[PDB]
UniProtKB/Swiss-Prot annotation, chain A:
It comes from the Eukaryota. Belongs to the universal ribosomal protein uL18 family. Component of the large ribosomal subunit. Mature ribosomes consist of a small (40S) and a large (60S) subunit. The 40S subunit contains about 32 different proteins and 1 molecule of RNA (18S). The 60S subunit contains 45 different proteins and 3 molecules of RNA (25S, 5.8S and 5S). GO terms for biological process: ribosomal large subunit assembly; translation. This is Large ribosomal subunit protein uL18. The keyword Kinase does not apply. It comes from Candida albicans (strain SC5314 / ATCC MYA-2876). Keywords: Cytoplasm, Ribonucleoprotein, Ribosomal protein. Component of the ribosome, a large ribonucleoprotein complex responsible for the synthesis of proteins in the cell. The small ribosomal subunit (SSU) binds messenger RNAs (mRNAs) and translates the encoded message by selecting cognate aminoacyl-transfer RNA (tRNA) molecules. The large subunit (LSU) contains the ribosomal catalytic site termed the peptidyl transferase center (PTC), which catalyzes the formation of peptide bonds, thereby polymerizing the amino acids delivered by tRNAs into a polypeptide chain.
Curated annotation (Swiss-Prot), chain B:
GO terms for cellular component: cytosolic large ribosomal subunit. It comes from Candida albicans (strain SC5314 / ATCC MYA-2876). Keywords: Cytoplasm, Ribonucleoprotein, Ribosomal protein. Component of the large ribosomal subunit. Mature ribosomes consist of a small (40S) and a large (60S) subunit. The 40S subunit contains about 32 different proteins and 1 molecule of RNA (18S). The 60S subunit contains 45 different proteins and 3 molecules of RNA (25S, 5.8S and 5S). SUPFAM superfamilies: Translation proteins SH3-like domain. The keyword Protein biosynthesis does not apply. Disulfide bonds: none annotated. It is found in: Cytoplasm. The lineage of its organism: Eukaryota, Fungi, Dikarya, Ascomycota, Saccharomycotina. Component of the ribosome, a large ribonucleoprotein complex responsible for the synthesis of proteins in the cell. The small ribosomal subunit (SSU) binds messenger RNAs (mRNAs) and translates the encoded message by selecting cognate aminoacyl-transfer RNA (tRNA) molecules. The large subunit (LSU) contains the ribosomal catalytic site termed the peptidyl transferase center (PTC), which catalyzes the formation of peptide bonds, thereby polymerizing the amino acids delivered by tRNAs into a polypeptide chain. This is Large ribosomal subunit protein eL21. It comes from the Eukaryota.
From Swiss-Prot, chain C:
SUPFAM superfamilies: RL5-like. Component of the ribosome, a large ribonucleoprotein complex responsible for the synthesis of proteins in the cell. The small ribosomal subunit (SSU) binds messenger RNAs (mRNAs) and translates the encoded message by selecting cognate aminoacyl-transfer RNA (tRNA) molecules. The large subunit (LSU) contains the ribosomal catalytic site termed the peptidyl transferase center (PTC), which catalyzes the formation of peptide bonds, thereby polymerizing the amino acids delivered by tRNAs into a polypeptide chain. Belongs to the universal ribosomal protein uL5 family. The gene is RPL11. Keywords: Cytoplasm, Ribonucleoprotein, Ribosomal protein. This is Large ribosomal subunit protein uL5. One of its GO terms (biological process) is translation. One of its GO terms (molecular function) is structural constituent of ribosome. One of its GO terms (cellular component) is cytosolic large ribosomal subunit.
UniProtKB/Swiss-Prot annotation, chain D:
Ribosome preservation factor that protect a small pool of nontranslating, vacant ribosomes in cells under nutrient starvation conditions. Under nutrient-limiting conditions, cells reduce ribosome biogenesis and degrade ribosomes via autophagy (ribophagy) or proteasomal degradation. To avoid excessive degradation during starvation, STM1 binds to and protects 80S ribosomes from proteasomal degradation. Under nutrient-sufficient conditions, TORC1 phosphorylates and inhibits STM1 to prevent formation of dormant 80S ribosomes. Phosphorylation by TORC1 upon nutrient replenishment inhibits STM1 and causes its release from dormant ribosomes. This is Ribosome-associated protein STM1. It comes from the Eukaryota. It is found in: Cytoplasm. Associates with mature 80S ribosomes. Binds to the head domain of the 40S ribosomal subunit and prevents mRNA binding by inserting its alpha-helix domain towards the mRNA entry tunnel at the decoding site, where it blocks the binding of tRNA and mRNA at the A- and P-sites. Interacts with eEF2; interaction sequesters eEF2 at the A-site of the ribosome, thereby blocking the interaction sites of the mRNA-tRNA complex, promoting ribosome stabilization and hibernation. Belongs to the STM1 family.
RNA sequence: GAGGUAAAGCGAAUGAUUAGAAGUCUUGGGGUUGAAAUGACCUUAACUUAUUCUCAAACUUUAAAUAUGUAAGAAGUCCUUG
RNA sequence: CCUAAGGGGGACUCAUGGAGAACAGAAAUCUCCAGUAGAACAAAAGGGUAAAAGUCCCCUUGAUUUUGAUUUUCAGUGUGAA
RNA sequence: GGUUGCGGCCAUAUCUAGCAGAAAGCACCGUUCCCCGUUCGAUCAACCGUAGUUAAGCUGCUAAGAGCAAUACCGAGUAGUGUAGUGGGAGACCAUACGCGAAACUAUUGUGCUGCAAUCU
């Protein structure tokens, strides 16, 4: 009764979007605004703080864009945190802060701006931008790229923002998206932000749940229970880690149990291979014959 | 009534290519233009700011100014009996490096390399390009290729 | 693999949408919204007419209908409360090709709420959106995609699931 | 009580009759006569 | 009313069709383009005869109608109405203009009629029939030629009916099961696409 | 490099346009079924599917020839560093 | 013509079709699926636009100040516009 | 070689219908104290990585698949066209000379490649 829609003319004239737009991964509007550089700053690149959250990981990368593809400057992942003393909640807001601090310190180590631009060594939750030192190199400027992730006051991407800013990177930002921002009274409650930086919300959930629903507390906070970690010693886990993160921010790759060639040989066994032209021609001939 | 507006007659010139509408690929925004670069001008219809006039669509010129999002290009236009130097401000979406530079700049390198080696070998080399010359003599073998005789064919109707 | 008896292929209610399309605006629509807020416990939302029809007595942007969406256990409770009024007997022509079904009560006091003369009686519309786990794929922002054919909800599966879970009859 | 309203998603700015609403396209509701 | 056809014989103007820009255009005199037994199958009428243009020219819709009527009348009178299928192969889509119906000021004309713009070698009329009915159909077209201006040739086609295949390639594709009926026309087998659908649609396909 | 004219195309978009064929009418009528069931049948007309004849200055995927922009160095290229 | 129909940001996807839901029917509202834009963008027509330039929401006045350069029409004058 | 994050070119990458997927990753998935947003914790926010699953997403493979791409003793040196003649023809138009030269069609082949970083039976 109605016209069939998926005609050959519909497919012929269809203009497929960009490959990474059809995957639903790149916002090219925002990417154009982020990447494009002042044409009179000829080959000087703009550096992006790419912050991406998976279900299990926090990925923070410092990226500059080029014609052949983006180039990573440094990268810090959340699964590196166990090396620094944070083993659970690798996607906290506080894990986001730790990852931001780690990537900031690692980048500054790579550049050589460690002793200059230390950052906020005593985290009190106050809004602050890395100010340049007179008669010295300017701080490493980095712009936050939150991708498709929505901008909400209290979001975890701004945890990486605050960590990287406190780590010594100059990242332009405002404090009205941090947890503890009063929108009615336009000031930042730095006490609540400091609470969030050192896992205060998680510790308060542990304390509040333990005396109300112990069975749910046993399932949600299992790892803490078998690690004998109570609420009162949650903060130190982050507070020490920060210090440890500042002590040795260098990247240590995981020692690989197998070589590249062994990985490739193992994976190649489970990969179907395209039929040769002769194989599918023989298949067609057989299907014709069995049709008589 | 005649109409002679700014974009009159640009119905097809400023159209996007078939199945090429929409967002600009970002290599356009990553290219670097320096004063003295030779650039082709081709208006992109989807960016209306910094758009060239239809005269400069398809013209090639010299970059003389570099700004935040644009380049200044020098064009020589015939006005009567002489050329007039035109200075057009173009956003980089309407601009592309001319591919004639990269070929000639390679011939400069090749000439320099050939010249230095000839000095090392104490011989001479000729670097001037040459037009195609008439071909030399040659012998055509007919083993397996004995000449086949053709004739004009009779007239037929094929409808 | 590709097992049809997989845990994640389990059919279950996504949402139940309650529609009352009172043809006018004012006191009657406000009281219909009160009825919906009473039944669902949630503030309903009023829908405006998309265009003007003289025959129906509506005009563009006039607030005509009110509807509310309920999910979870409350949706199940309201659905069975409405199936009681239908005495657990739907038709084969109540299930869409996409695996959703709906019915319509005619008086809202049959559901089991107190009757008020000031409020009066409003009819009500019930629609249940069925779906398995993984529908977030079609609704999330990043990497949004479509659901595979085997994982889709269709009319036959929904009819069989309705018959099994409610011991009801689908009158073909 | 709060009064949220359903938002507009369509782009039809015209305040007129909509597409495919013709008379005589309907069956006979009184065909049983 | 109508000027002599000599006033509109040559393709002097660009094509001027009906559009959103000229709307008050009359209708063409020719409305029927298929005559005779137009429902006959392809195998019934193997012989095709064309009336071919030897002119780059304009033919009015009136001339098309007159020639169509002349050919149809003669062939149905001599051989019967079901012994042929006549098809007119040119449609008048070009609008002629008339000015008088001051002086040269504001002289853009009004629609006056319709004409088909034909090239050299363009087929004007096609008649599919049986072989034994050749001399009749030819004589049907030879009379219709009188209704046209310019030179036209009557050419006996090398092909089977209105198909694009020669009378020998059609027989080869027919005994090989590659041709099926489609009413008055046929469908040919394709070696592309779904193999099962192709096999189902052409059961007698002797594959090689 | 640029172009969208000639040509070409229309079982490619838009617009125009000839003919059948096979399906669905469940959201077309007439007739014939029924003591009533809208639940069949014959028909024309609709649409749908795969086809078919013919077209466009203000249609188009494609796309010339001629004409047209730039370049073919010393005011150049390379090396070092103010 | 427009204090937004200007500016910035965010969220969403349009025309239409199919299958479903009391009154409700060809057209009211709800739901799902399909949907390259077949919608919309003040007004002619053309071009342009889909995580937008369209729809809705939030904040605003850059529709501000100073005076130069440039493009079009061109005498390379003015005016308009950019 | 697989996978993820960020990409370049922007269908050889899209679309339809099937099938398979070790490891890790990704994903679906669980919860609502907290920041936050909703008619609706569905989307968005946060928390746990704990209770579960490869069912879907994703990836690969299959199809005389649709589309797309490339190629060519394919069509066709055809259509068109620059230049020429005191060429033909009443004309419409056509042939020839020196040059340039398509599109459709037909056939065949293919169905993403790749940069940086991290990770993996």
């Amino acid at each position: 009764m109605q016209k069939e829609f998926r005609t050959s003319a519909y497919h012929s004239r269809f203009q497929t979007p960009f490959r990474r737009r059809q995957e639903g991964k790149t916002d090219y509007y925002q990417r154009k605004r982020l990447v494009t550089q002042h044409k009179a700053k000829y080959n000087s690149p703009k550096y992006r703080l790419v912050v991406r959250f998976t279900n299990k990981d926090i990925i923070a990368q410092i990226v500059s864009a080029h014609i052949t593809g983006d180039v990573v400057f440094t990268a810090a992942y959340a699964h590196e945190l166990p090396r620094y003393g944070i083993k659970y909640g690798l996607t906290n807001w506080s894990a986001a802060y730790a990852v931001g601090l780690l990537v900031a310190r690692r980048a500054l180590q790579k550049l050589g701006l460690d002793e200059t631009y230390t950052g906020v060594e005593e985290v009190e939750g106050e809004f602050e931008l890395t100010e340049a030192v007179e008669d010295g190199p300017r701080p490493f400027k980095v712009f936050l790229d939150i991708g498709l992730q929505r901008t909400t006051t209290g979001a975890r991407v701004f945890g990486v923002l605050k960590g990287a800013s406190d780590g010594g990177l100059y990242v332009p930002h405002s404090p009205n998206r941090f947890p503890g921002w009063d929108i009615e009274a336009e000031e930042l409650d730095a006490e609540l932000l400091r609470k969030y930086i050192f896992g205060g919300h998680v510790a308060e959930y542990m304390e509040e749940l333990l005396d109300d629903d112990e069975e749910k507390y046993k399932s949600i906070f299992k790892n803490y229970i078998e690690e004998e970690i109570e609420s009162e010693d949650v903060e130190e886990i982050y507070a020490n880690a920060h210090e440890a993160i500042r002590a040795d921010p260098s990247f240590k790759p995981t020692e690989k149990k197998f070589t590249k060639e062994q990985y490739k040989a193992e994976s190649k066994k489970y990969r179907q291979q395209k039929l040769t032209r002769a194989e599918r021609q023989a298949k067609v001939a057989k299907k014709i014959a069995e049709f008589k | 009534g005649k109409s002679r507006g700014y974009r009159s007659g640009t119905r097809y010139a400023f159209q996007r290519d078939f199945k090429k509408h929409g967002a600009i690929p970002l290599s356009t925004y990553l290219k670097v233009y320096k004063v003295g670069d030779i650039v082709d001008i081709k208006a992109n219809g989807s960016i209306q700011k910094g758009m060239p006039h239809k005269y400069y669509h398809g013209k090639t010129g010299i970059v003389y100014n570099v700004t935040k999002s644009s380049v200044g290009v020098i064009i020589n236009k015939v006005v009567g009996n002489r050329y007039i130097e035109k200075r057009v401000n173009l956003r980089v979406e309407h601009v592309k490096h001319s591919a004639c530079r990269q070929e000639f700049l390679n011939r400069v390198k090749s000439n320099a390399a050939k010249k230095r080696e000839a000095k090392a070998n104490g011989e001479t080399v000729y670097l001037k390009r040459q037009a195609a010359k008439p071909r030399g003599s040659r012998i055509i073998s007919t083993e397996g290729n004995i000449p086949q005789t053709l004739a004009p064919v009779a007239y037929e109707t094929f409808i | 693999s590709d097992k049809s008896q997989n845990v994640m292929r389990e059919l279950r209610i996504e949402k139940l949408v309650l529609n009352i399309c009172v043809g006018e605006s004012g006191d009657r629509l406000t009281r219909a919204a009160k009825v919906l807020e009473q039944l669902s416990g949630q503030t309903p939302v009023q829908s405006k007419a998309r265009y003007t029809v003289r025959t129906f007595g509506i005009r563009r942007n006039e607030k005509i209908a009110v509807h509310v969406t309920v999910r979870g256990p409350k949706a199940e409770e309201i659905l069975e409360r409405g199936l009681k009024v239908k005495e657990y007997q739907l038709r084969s022509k109540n299930f869409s090709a996409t695996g959703n079904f709906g019915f319509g009560i005619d008086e809202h006091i049959d559901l089991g709420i107190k009757y008020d003369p000031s409020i009066g009686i409003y009819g009500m519309d019930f629609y249940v959106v069925m779906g398995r786990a993984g529908a977030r794929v079609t609704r999330r922002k990043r990497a949004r995609s479509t659901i595979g054919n085997s994982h889709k909800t269709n009319k036959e599966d929904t009819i069989q699931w309705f018959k099994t879970r409610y011991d009801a009859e689908v009158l073909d | 009580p709060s009064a949220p309203s359903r938002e507009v998603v369509k782009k039809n700015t015209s305040s007129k009759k909509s597409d495919a609403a013709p008379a005589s396209a309907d069956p006979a509701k009184a065909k049983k006569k | 009313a109508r000027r002599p056809a000599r006033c509109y014989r040559y393709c002097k103007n660009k094509p001027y069709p009906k559009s959103r820009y000229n709307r008050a255009v009359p209708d063409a005199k020719i409305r029927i383009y298929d005559l005779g037994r137009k429902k006959a199958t392809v195998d019934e009428f193997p012989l095709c005869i064309h009336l071919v243009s030897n002119e780059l020219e304009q033919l009015s819709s009136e001339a098309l109608e007159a020639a169509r009527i002349c050919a149809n009348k003669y062939i149905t009178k001599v051989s019967g109405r079901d012994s042929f299928h006549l098809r007119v192969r040119v449609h008048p889509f070009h609008v002629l203009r008339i000015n008088k119906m001051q002086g040269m000021r504001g002289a853009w004309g009004k629609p006056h009629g319709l004409a088909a713009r034909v090239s050299i070698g363009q087929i004007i009329m096609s008649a599919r029939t049986k072989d034994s009915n050749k001399d009749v159909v030819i004589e049907g077209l030879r009379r219709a030629r009188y209704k046209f201006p310019g030179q036209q040739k009557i050419i006996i086609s090398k092909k089977w009916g209105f198909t694009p295949l020669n009378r020998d390639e059609y027989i080869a594709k027919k005994t090989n099961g590659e041709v099926i009926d489609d009413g008055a026309y046929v469908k040919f087998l394709s070696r592309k696409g779904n193999l099962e659908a192709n096999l189902q649609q052409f059961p007698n396909y002797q594959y090689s």
